[PDB]
């Protein structure tokens, strides 16, 4: 990706847990939602939410 599209983090949205994206946490790619596996917070997803190699290559 020599300079092409840098990609951020996704960080919990809560401070206090603040967990990077994980296969733990329910993602419910369908309901364009990702729950929580620790805070139970329901985030709604980014509007760029295409850097991210993570999603392109959804487990
Ligand atoms: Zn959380």
Known sequence: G???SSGEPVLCSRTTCRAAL???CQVD???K???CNFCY???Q???SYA???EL???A
């Open 33 to 35: 939602l990702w729950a």
């Open 45 to 47: 997803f980014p509007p």
């Open 22 to 24: 994980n296969p733990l």
């Open 41 to 43: 917070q329901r985030n």
């Open 51 to 53: 850097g991210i190699s």
């Open 29 to 31: 790619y369908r309901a």
């Open 56 to 58: 392109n290559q959804p």
């Open 2 to 4: 020599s300079s092409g």
